[PDB]
Specification:
homotetramer; 331 residues; alpha/beta; UDP-galactose 4-epimerase, domain 1; Rossmann fold; 2 domains; seven-stranded parallel sheet; two-stranded parallel ribbon; globular; binds NADPH dihydro-nicotinamide-adenine-dinucleotide phosphate; binds guanosine-5'-diphosphate; EC 4.2.1.47 (chains B, C); GTP binding (chains B, C); nucleotide-binding (chains B, C); NAD(P)-bd_dom_sf (chains B, C)
Amino acid sequence: RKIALITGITGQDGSYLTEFLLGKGYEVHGLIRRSSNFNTQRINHIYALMKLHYADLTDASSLRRWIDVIKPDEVYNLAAQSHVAVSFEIPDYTADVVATGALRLLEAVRSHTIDSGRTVKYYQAGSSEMFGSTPPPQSETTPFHPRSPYAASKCAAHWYTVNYREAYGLFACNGILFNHESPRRGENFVTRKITRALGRIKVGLQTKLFLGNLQASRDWGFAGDYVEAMWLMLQQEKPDDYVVATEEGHTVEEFLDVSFGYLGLNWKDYVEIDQRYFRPAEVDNLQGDASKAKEVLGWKPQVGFEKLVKMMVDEDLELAKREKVLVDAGY
Amino acid sequence: RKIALITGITGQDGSYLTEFLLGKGYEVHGLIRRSSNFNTQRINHIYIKALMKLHYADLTDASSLRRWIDVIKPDEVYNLAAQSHVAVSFEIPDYTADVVATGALRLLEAVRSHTIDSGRTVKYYQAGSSEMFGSTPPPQSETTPFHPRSPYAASKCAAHWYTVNYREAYGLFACNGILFNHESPRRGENFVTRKITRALGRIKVGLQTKLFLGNLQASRDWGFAGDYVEAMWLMLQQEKPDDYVVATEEGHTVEEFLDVSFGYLGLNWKDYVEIDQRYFRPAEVDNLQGDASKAKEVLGWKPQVGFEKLVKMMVDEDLELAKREKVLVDAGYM
Amino acid sequence: RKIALITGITGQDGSYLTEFLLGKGYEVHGLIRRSSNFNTQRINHIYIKALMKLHYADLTDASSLRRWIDVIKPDEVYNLAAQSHVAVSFEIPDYTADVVATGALRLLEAVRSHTIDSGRTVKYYQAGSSEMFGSTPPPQSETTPFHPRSPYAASKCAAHWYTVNYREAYGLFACNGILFNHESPRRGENFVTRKITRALGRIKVGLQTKLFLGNLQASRDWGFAGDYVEAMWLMLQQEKPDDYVVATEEGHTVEEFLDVSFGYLGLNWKDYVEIDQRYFRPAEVDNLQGDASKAKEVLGWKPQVGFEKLVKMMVDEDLELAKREKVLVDAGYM
Amino acid sequence: RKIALITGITGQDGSYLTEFLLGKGYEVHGLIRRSSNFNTQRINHIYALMKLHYADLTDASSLRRWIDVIKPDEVYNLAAQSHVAVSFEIPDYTADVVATGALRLLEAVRSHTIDSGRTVKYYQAGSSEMFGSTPPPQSETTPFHPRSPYAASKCAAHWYTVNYREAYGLFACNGILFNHESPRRGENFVTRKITRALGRIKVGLQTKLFLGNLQASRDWGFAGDYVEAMWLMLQQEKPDDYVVATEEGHTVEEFLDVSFGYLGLNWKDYVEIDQRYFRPAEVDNLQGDASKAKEVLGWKPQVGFEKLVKMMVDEDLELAKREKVLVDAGY
Ligand SMILES: NC(=O)C1=CN([C@@H]2O[C@H](COP(=O)(O)OP(=O)(O)OC[C@H]3O[C@@H](n4cnc5c(N)ncnc54)[C@H](OP(=O)(O)O)[C@@H]3O)[C@@H](O)[C@H]2O)C=CC1
Ligand SMILES: NC(=O)C1=CN([C@@H]2O[C@H](COP(=O)(O)OP(=O)(O)OC[C@H]3O[C@@H](n4cnc5c(N)ncnc54)[C@H](OP(=O)(O)O)[C@@H]3O)[C@@H](O)[C@H]2O)C=CC1
Ligand SMILES: NC(=O)C1=CN([C@@H]2O[C@H](COP(=O)(O)OP(=O)(O)OC[C@H]3O[C@@H](n4cnc5c(N)ncnc54)[C@H](OP(=O)(O)O)[C@@H]3O)[C@@H](O)[C@H]2O)C=CC1
Ligand SMILES: NC(=O)C1=CN([C@@H]2O[C@H](COP(=O)(O)OP(=O)(O)OC[C@H]3O[C@@H](n4cnc5c(N)ncnc54)[C@H](OP(=O)(O)O)[C@@H]3O)[C@@H](O)[C@H]2O)C=CC1
Ligand SMILES: Nc1nc2c(ncn2[C@@H]2O[C@H](COP(=O)(O)OP(=O)(O)O)[C@@H](O)[C@H]2O)c(=O)[nH]1
Ligand SMILES: Nc1nc2c(ncn2[C@@H]2O[C@H](COP(=O)(O)OP(=O)(O)O)[C@@H](O)[C@H]2O)c(=O)[nH]1
Ligand SMILES: Nc1nc2c(ncn2[C@@H]2O[C@H](COP(=O)(O)OP(=O)(O)O)[C@@H](O)[C@H]2O)c(=O)[nH]1
Ligand SMILES: Nc1nc2c(ncn2[C@@H]2O[C@H](COP(=O)(O)OP(=O)(O)O)[C@@H](O)[C@H]2O)c(=O)[nH]1
């Protein structure tokens, strides 16, 4: 049975990748951070085929320890302080996890393979955020012009990963994934923030939705579809980097149009602009060119924009309906 | 309106201290870690205008600490942040040390730097632990020698000494609270007391049938977190800074905890408990029982919640949680 | 009297920049690492009243950086600190990244925090490198894409982007100097140019007989460090911050360096050089040649020391050192 | 041939330990920091039996990498930002190296032994500074009351080391060494600062010597003698902690009396007190009780106080004589 080690297993992507790999017959191990509260909300339903271990990307010893014990065949580095706005607040921590943390994992894997003689395939969770202000459409070779500490740190991780492949022959691939959402997306990201609020507004638990820049345009796909691409990259004869995206861009305003309209509401009756949600340096327009992924990996997105928006609205409306009962039942 | 900055505000103690200080009229700020999931479960009820504010930071990021101290200009700083689990510390020793030992020094240095650059005065509290005593026999008082038995314990010893040093070398009003074990309905579920009451509730309603534990003979001095945070505040209100043991002065074994808890619900723990060697620690701490005479005399502090009341408080709460879970499971929502 | 804070003051560039700024009437402060041995060899002659001050700090210690920025209140900050050797970076990638990439961000954030808290204005220089271009073919200008070929190079790319981001997001007057290779008689002996001239001097006097090297076909744009530090200062005197390539625009191979150096002393390098595969890098950078048109047009900067003059300057100095060593060795003092 | 790995090999102790172990037939490896300048001054004369490798105690990956490659039989952790005064200036860095760095090495060794099944003996460079203000004589069990960030960090390293021995059965020993000097002692420490200045004053290159607290009392031994004790601890049947000291205390003023008097000078004609050399929190009196080391290890110091002072004065006078020639010859 193939063994996969996933860092960031508790996150959106880790939860879907875990289900995907288990379905493929893998033995899946994940590294999780010790937390004072429950932090396995996304994978509790899955939880001898899935094992969790305490570690941290800022602790190199912890990474090597588990790689040695697990002896994984594939390593997926999904761990990250993944929020752009938050990265402006904690740039140093973000860099240590997103940039240096990736290098620590790469070095631990490289050290493991040398000492044990084993072979390990590696995936780095790259991001379209790396392109920053470089105009669309963005492909694998489009120049990076990062606009946040998070983005710059991902650029660093990208190059550390390319370097380990070129210098050591490590089978390391960089997935340059554009924004991907789902009903498990963090509530601090704009899409989930909108659908969560919409659900609550629909049932009467909320009356206002505060947002920032509605004109930012993004290429939004479904996380469930994207994790398949990660796996596909590691199944090729040679390692390489690939853009994974829907190739269709939409503004936050369009997301609002589709979501609220879907439930028969006019978002303008509820949305208010709060300048505190603006970023110090904005990324105006991301739209990927995923031609390479289609040609080489045979990968294509299955969930389209409106389908994704509506999937998220349906799920968050159900959550809001449950909350309405509780708030009402005296809970 | 006094301003307090609490690191570790999302934890058990941070949640109770926040409520306590807000009740005293403070403006409370807390440092929280960015998380992929919600991590404010213990304080959301509080958060829900401008008296409690949360900010992103990390004890392994000195820049983040100084940034908020400069912006907030706190009058009191309570360092409660820590990878606080002993068993886990053996698994991630390096990370634990960076947060529990060096992280404390980073905060001390950020506070010292802030006071020097701004000319302001700040009072400081370090969350010390009876775990520092380790294998040193009880009763343990402020002058009892430390013999740490885990990376966590050794790191707390380090934080203790860094704190004492900043007080002695720079005159910083820094106090070390040497608190013995304190629990509550908000205690992490991985600690033995909460693990037991959570399991008990589920066993009582039929959602669980076996409870796996390790060393049942370990003895601890267990108090209520709500009572203990009051002592933290009291230390910072004294004329001079000092270190104080905060404890109930009564010890009980894990086995006694089982007796009281299961017996409270008419069950025999021996019917459900099984011993799993995986829960034993590489180096155990056999018996902790504090001598809190100093705290009683100087601070006028005394615990209000006794052992039995604490156990029952936790059992009642976790039984209610278990009943709610039973409804959800039977209905197909869990 | 303007105040400059230089990180990496003990290095090649720091030593020349210090002399340059002192000549401009600056009060210069430098951050140095504590070392078990003396580490001020390049600047001791300068240090020897109150115009050059040294302070202990480390780019991996954010607290130390902010502490000195607060005390010093610099007008200009030059981040020259780095584990600057490419070959070494493959051996200690993690440490290199923490200093070269994150360390730069720590300094940027400390400066940003200082300016926000104090209301002061600070100009900032980041020591970028042509190594960032990696395998991207020459000539390389400010807009040439980066394709780093070492952990060091990737880390410098990171520092470059963190710096650009602080300029764009916060309006910090931060400039990236994209300097191509620059040498001098103070160049580290582990870099190829100094390794060659040091060995040549010893070979000329009979203290050494073989010179082991790696890839002789690698081509570099080599300028004089003394000329380049002037460009750093010039960037910070402009109306607005920007990034600039600083180079001679002429490339030469390691083999040409050998031809010029050994030939200058009437020797045939082929009689002494041997190739040792251990000196080859896991991923090589084949050809760097800068396009410094922007620097020439905007800064009015132009290199004064050409390739041959630079090689001879280094050979002359290292021959003198070798002669001194010969005396000591023959006399039993070495 | 036994293999030893020494961290801090470029320091005073590492240089003497290297010579001692090589004399015992060991293959010695040392970890050194990359430096912009020469940093092997103390071991250049020694430099296939001595190998140096780049690493850093703040980089766990580097430590494990070399332990795996070298497969040492004995590990001596001598690496540290070892100056007390300096520790008040850079407390965070000092702690990361002296406290956490020791734990990183312990964990790397432990991880190595588990993954490889090998056995490794370990030595931690403890210090009498850990006792701080606790009154003398100080023995192995004397309570610690550290008076500096450096001291507190050593206390931490001490306990991390004791814990690895107690929890994992690691053969780890803590050498609680009292102050030890030599002609290789760092010039920023009081003894070497005095003898270096004395030599220069004697030849006319210096006229004043600025010092701080002359009433501090220390137990001063010879570094060459002390490294033997380190080795001896690792040769015992069981691991333990041992105080290594001369059991005789002297004030800085007495050191001045002996040193300057030795060359026929009156130190009062040259010494001036500069308050900047006072420490925020002073350690007044250290005097060790090395009974255990004598009884168990059979260790006893060979170089006494005055012998040590005079050894240092002789060496630094020669150095000053060489400098006088150079400064004179126009160099
Ligand atoms: N989703 C997107 O649209 C895009 C995301 N990415 C990247 O892909 C990856 C997955 O994204 P996504 O699932 O949405 O992200 P999430 O924020 O949902 O999950 C992040 C994961 O990283 C973990 N983590 C954070 N810090 C550390 C640390 N110091 N040590 C160990 N683990 C840590 C988190 O743990 P915890 O639960 O404890 O916080 C969580 O498991 C990330 O690297 C992200 O940056 C790339 C392109 C676009
Ligand atoms: N409770 C006891 O019986 C005793 C506890 N102590 C100590 O007192 C303090 C409070 O304990 P308690 O509330 O039960 O502990 P918890 O484990 O419940 O809470 C720990 C807190 O620290 C935070 N934290 C952890 N790591 C970091 C980090 N790197 N940066 C910032 N914050 C971080 C946690 O955040 P997150 O929610 O993100 O994990 C949480 O807010 C701790 O220091 C503990 O060690 C002392 C004596 C006895
Ligand atoms: N020289 C060149 O050809 C090129 C160099 N560069 C870059 O320009 C800068 C200057 O180069 P150059 O003078 O030759 O480099 P050097 O290697 O000579 O000097 C590096 C300096 O950084 C210090 N330093 C290293 N690590 C740390 C740390 N953790 N904390 C604090 N200080 C530290 C060194 O101190 P110590 O003396 O203690 O080691 C030294 O002062 C560097 O950033 C280099 O990467 C850019 C383009 C080309
Ligand atoms: N000497 C004494 O009187 C006493 C000393 N001690 C301790 O014993 C040990 C040896 O002392 P001594 O030789 O005088 O000390 P030194 O200061 O002479 O040497 C310290 C050594 O540690 C190295 N080092 C420092 N920081 C790091 C780092 N981050 N990573 C790797 N190596 C590093 C130094 O390298 P570099 O050369 O690059 O600076 C040097 O090799 C130290 O741990 C010291 O604290 C204990 C009791 C008393
Ligand atoms: N998170 C967030 N983003 C917002 C908000 N209002 C507008 N946006 C914008 O929506 C875009 C997407 O943000 P986010 O979902 O956080 O993902 P990103 O693409 O990784 O930044 C960015 O341009 C944000 O500035 C808001 O309230 N929250
Ligand atoms: N956490 C935990 N502790 C257990 C268990 N079984 C016995 N104990 C013991 O209970 C005591 C208290 O453990 P814990 O609540 O984690 O708090 P500590 O005092 O901070 O270690 C220790 O002696 C543990 O070894 C178990 O399953 N979990
Ligand atoms: N340092 C070094 N470089 C060498 C050697 N032999 C050839 N070179 C090459 O010379 C070029 C310049 O190396 P270096 O001076 O270290 O500077 P870099 O340009 O910062 O790598 C690179 O292509 C090296 O591979 C050698 O023995 N040492
Ligand atoms: N380093 C140093 N110590 C001094 C000086 N003047 C007095 N001392 C004292 O001498 C004692 C020994 O200092 P040091 O040699 O640095 O070693 P320590 O015992 O590790 O602090 C301490 O009490 C210092 O305060 C001075 O100029 N430098």
